[PDB]
What we know:
The first copy, chain A, is an all-alpha fold and 39 residues long. Chain A has two helices and no strands. Chains in contact: A-B, A-C, B-C. The A-C interface holds A 23-24, 26-29, 32-33, 36, 39 and C 16-17, 20-21, 23-24, 27-28, 30-32, 34, 46, 49-50. Chain C: It is found in: Secreted; Periplasm; Host cell membrane. Chain C: Toxin, which has some hemolytic activity towards mammalian cells. Acts by forming a pore-like structure upon contact with mammalian cells. Chain C: Monomer and oligomer. In periplasm, it is present as a monomer, while in outer membrane vesicles, it oligomerizes to form a pore structure that is active. The pore is formed by a dodecamer. Chain C: The chain crosses the membrane at residues 34-51.
Amino acid sequence: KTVEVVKNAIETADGALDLYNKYLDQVIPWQTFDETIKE
Amino acid sequence: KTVEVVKNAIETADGALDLYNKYLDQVIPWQTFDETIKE
Amino acid sequence: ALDSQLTNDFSEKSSYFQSQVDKIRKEAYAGAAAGVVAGPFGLIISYSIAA
Lengths: 39, 39, 51
């Protein structure tokens, strides 16, 4: 039960990215931009 | 069990956005506006 | 026919353009604006990232 900190942190960092992008996308509408380009 | 605060908060922040938009949409009917434009 | 339509259809995309770039602002600033939760210095970061 010493390494479990790293593990728990690893998973913390994962969901970090997730929220990061999730917001980054809301912030930078590349979806909307790209889509708009295609059509 | 020190980093778990960040993790828990990360997830708190996630559902924050969610409710945020969820309401923001109820508030700004872009769905209805866009739809209305298309038809 | 082609000309007739391509003319009408072109003005329809030119309308879709601005109506769409709008969607882009509305999506991005509703996003930066969302920085009110974390500090106003967060807005500088957020809004710079966005606008």
